Amino acid sequence: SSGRIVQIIGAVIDVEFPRDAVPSIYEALKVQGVETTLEVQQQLGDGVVRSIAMGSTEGLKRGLNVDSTGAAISVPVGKATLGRIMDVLGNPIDEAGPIGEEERWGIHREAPSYADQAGGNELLETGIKVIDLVCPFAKGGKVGLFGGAGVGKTVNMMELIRNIAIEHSGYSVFAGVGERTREGNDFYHEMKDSNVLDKVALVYGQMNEPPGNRLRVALTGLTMAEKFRDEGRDVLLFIDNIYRYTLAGTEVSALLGRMPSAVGYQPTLAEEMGVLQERITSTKKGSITSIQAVYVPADDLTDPSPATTFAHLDATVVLSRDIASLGIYPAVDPLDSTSRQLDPLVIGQDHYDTARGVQYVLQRYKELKDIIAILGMDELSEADKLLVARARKIQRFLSQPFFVAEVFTGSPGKYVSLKDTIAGFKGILNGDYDHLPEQAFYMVGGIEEAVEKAKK
């Protein structure tokens, strides 16, 4: 039956129902006049539910009549979502008519079971040298791109979309969670101009929205990817800022009556992260390859939101403000980026030995920073001087010009295969290019382009 609004504090609305007609947890509700959707979070007792609005609450008053829909928030799924832009409720926002779907799915469901999990270590080549070297990816795996403000996260994801699109022929789901509306318009017009829009489904809940939309939009994009996975396909899922789901759970947490945890976060932080992240996996029916950008607040990696995010991922790419302040892009810290595919029974002994030697030379270069800053390079020993020289050539050769960064520089982008990366870093570590200057190793694709840049 119908209830009445008794309390409005921000995004959180308390609705009183009759006692034989109290709606369940995660049930959608509709205000009778304005058609605002509410989603039930808590049952407080006394007939009263506490809910979060999926929209603006200005103009709402106490005493408004609220209907219950009997089910959760259900979004369209299937073939009809491709090429289309939708919001959190599944309504189209691209001015292109209704979605002609054949079925709708609720956005809340459980994780797949332990017996339905799928193992696999088949390598996915990205064309980027530092990513293929020190933290390699797998098909059906999970990628985090950690980093602070303005260090590159979106540029790297756009390059990873462009290079992972080469050898992939299935579908893709892109979810914008709490990021820039201008970035959504640019990516849609780029895919529409180059005719790849009909393989990709777009869901957007951006920084301009009330926090219920930002709290629930990644569930909608994951529900569409779960329908594509349960049809037996291989699908790509891209999520720009998963940190922005979490921060939306900050913004409603004290309004839901919760005591705060450490540094003001919600006390249910790891459970909301686990209930979202355990649905992203590949199963035995089909596979999901996922790339997620992860924001780091105030450049602090020991902040609890990235520190809970770290164990949910197969591959972790950590970006650094210091490496980008040296001018090196894509700005990956090679001593902080790990993956479980860096293992000699997956990639072979040669690639693993080259990656361990690169990490050894960069770690011993990192240990000499204060003594190089105070007394200089001249009072090192001779093998230390040779290792600092090879370390600066390794640090310059880890940078790469990108195809999506052609607007920033004018230099053309490069695709480097894995074999050329292993051979070039092996040739730097063995001493084959000790006669080259270090600025010839900067912003080239192969080691042969460093050989041609040295004669200039």
Partner: protein, 512 residues
């Protein structure tokens, strides 16, 4: 003039208008007032105990943790979202119990003991209590039997015995799970059964750990207990006690067991969530005040008990045998901050710890053990005789070598005792490196400690030490098989074994 308590709701008050007597509802029955975030607040249940199971409709069970004046706060052992206000709740009269037995070996279960591997039902003949009190001081026997992890640095410098608690602490992705899983894998011919408890992990990591146990032939000796990241925080809080009860079945019948808790920090996060949602008052980093007690009631259950306790427990069926339970908790720190609350509590509970550091992990020392900060409280009591005799004083000499190697970085000329100390420390540092999934027996490690500590490595330069070690072990496996088997019977050492290893290394350095 305080706020409204959860029994101040008008059906309850109108009930008291219709009949003032408390016997309108039975003392073993109640009704759901409120459902929020896995917390169910219940009016009634006047005969409930702390930790008692509560039956909800639909097969859902819960546990009462807050017993207030007017209301009962309960946490749901499963999904909570199907529960509703006005449902009837029942006292079962029972505390939470799990299946125990040797039938759980080879199986992957959840925190309640239901199987999740799809391999059928578990035919356990016995159940036992999840929350239990550790045995008293008169019923214990001192730790004096070895547990071999297969690693040179652990079995030579920080040894673990049967009934000891040894922490594995360190930063993210530097090999904590690798050490614990390889210590489980090395028990496949030892007689010690194993329990691995995964708290807060993702499910694919759990299935990768179970396939890495199955590829190395160790899955049939191991119970796996899983409480993954999308499960309820109550099951994540109760999973180490349930796996501890499953390990303690073997301890109470005069047999030996080993258990890994792969994240006790995530169990502290789950108990912090349950304590904040029950509105218990917080302290440092919003953790509850009883959180040290949360670990200390767990890790004190790992113990070695005497023969008289085993004869009292089995009623004379098992005589003359001790039982033990060895614990390996694992604690994640945040960028080397050991001053946080939960790592301070767990270092203060255990019988020593193994510290793993990110810098030596990046510098190629792959087991990554900081010998200056790591320690064993049982010591040479937890070792065999040949390993105790050959490893005496290695750890403190390596700590003195890390002091001396940073003292003499820019020294022009040093004396002979200093040059000898630095050269010996460089060879022992290179000898302690070891690959993942390659265990070493007692005989191979004693060949390596004889070669480092008797000065057979002083002509071997540093990039050849690992090759010298593998070639010397391959030479004793072709030419002295009865000697390596005789060392591998018990770990014995006398003059004849000493002369045989000395003649074998002298002939290896003569001819190879």
């Amino acid at each position: 003039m305080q706020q409204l308590n959860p029994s101040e709701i008008s059906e309850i008050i109108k009930g008291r208008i219709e009949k003032l007597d408390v016997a309108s509802q039975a003392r073993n029955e109640g009704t759901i007032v409120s459902v929020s975030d896995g917390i169910v607040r219940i009016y009634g249940l006047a005969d409930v105990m702390y930790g008692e199971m509560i039956e909800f409709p639909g097969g859902v069970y819960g546990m009462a943790l807050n017993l207030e004046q007017d209301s009962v706060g309960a946490v749901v052992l499963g999904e909570y979202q199907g529960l509703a206000e006005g449902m009837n709740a029942k006292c079962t009269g029972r505390i939470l119990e799990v299946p125990v037995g040797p039938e759980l070996l080879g199986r992957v279960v959840d925190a309640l003991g239901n199987p999740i591997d799809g391999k059928g039902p578990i035919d356990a003949k016995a159940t036992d209590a999840v929350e239990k009190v550790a045995p008293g001081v008169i019923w214990r026997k001192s730790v004096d039997q070895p547990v071999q992890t297969g690693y040179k640095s652990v079995d030579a410098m920080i040894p673990v015995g049967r009934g000891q608690r040894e922490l594995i602490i360190g930063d993210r992705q530097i090999g904590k799970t690798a050490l614990a899983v390889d210590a489980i894998i090395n028990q496949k011919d030892s007689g010690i059964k194993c329990v691995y408890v995964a708290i807060g992990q993702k499910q694919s990591t759990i299935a990768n750990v179970v396939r890495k146990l199955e590829e190395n032939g160790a899955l049939a000796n191991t119970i796996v207990v899983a409480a993954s990241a999308s499960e309820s925080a109550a099951l994540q809080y109760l999973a180490p006690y349930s796996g501890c009860t499953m390990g303690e079945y073997f301890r109470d019948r005069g047999e030996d067991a080993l258990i890994v808790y792969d994240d006790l920090s995530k169990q502290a996060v789950a108990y912090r969530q349950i304590s904040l949602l029950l509105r218990r008052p917080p302290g440092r980093e919003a953790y509850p005040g009883d959180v040290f007690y949360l670990h200390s009631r767990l890790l004190e259950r790992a113990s070695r008990v005497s023969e008289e306790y085993v004869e009292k427990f089995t009623n004379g069926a098992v005589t003359g045998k001790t039982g033990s339970l060895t614990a390996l908790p694992i604690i994640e720190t945040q960028a080397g901050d050991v001053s946080a609350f939960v790592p301070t509590n767990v270092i203060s509970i255990t019988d020593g710890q193994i510290f793993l550091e990110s810098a030596m992990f990046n510098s190629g020392i792959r087991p990554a053990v900081n010998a200056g900060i790591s320690v064993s409280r049982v010591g040479g009591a937890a070792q065999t005789k040949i390993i105790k005799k050959l490893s005496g004083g290695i750890r403190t000499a390596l700590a003195q070598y890390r002091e001396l190697a940073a003292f003499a970085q820019f020294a022009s000329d040093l004396d002979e005792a200093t040059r000898k100390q630095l050269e010996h420390g460089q060879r022992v540092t290179e000898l302690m490196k070891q690959k993942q999934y390659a265990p070493m027996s007692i005989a191979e490690m004693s060949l390596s400690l004889y070669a480092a500590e008797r000065g057979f490595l002083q002509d071997v330069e540093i990039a050849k030490v690992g090759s010298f070690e593998q070639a010397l072990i391959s030479y004793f496996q072709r030419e002295h098989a009865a000697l390596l088997a005789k060392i591998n019977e018990k770990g014995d050492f006398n003059d004849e074994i000493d002369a045989g290893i000395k003649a074998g290394i002298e002939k290896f350095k003569a001819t190879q």
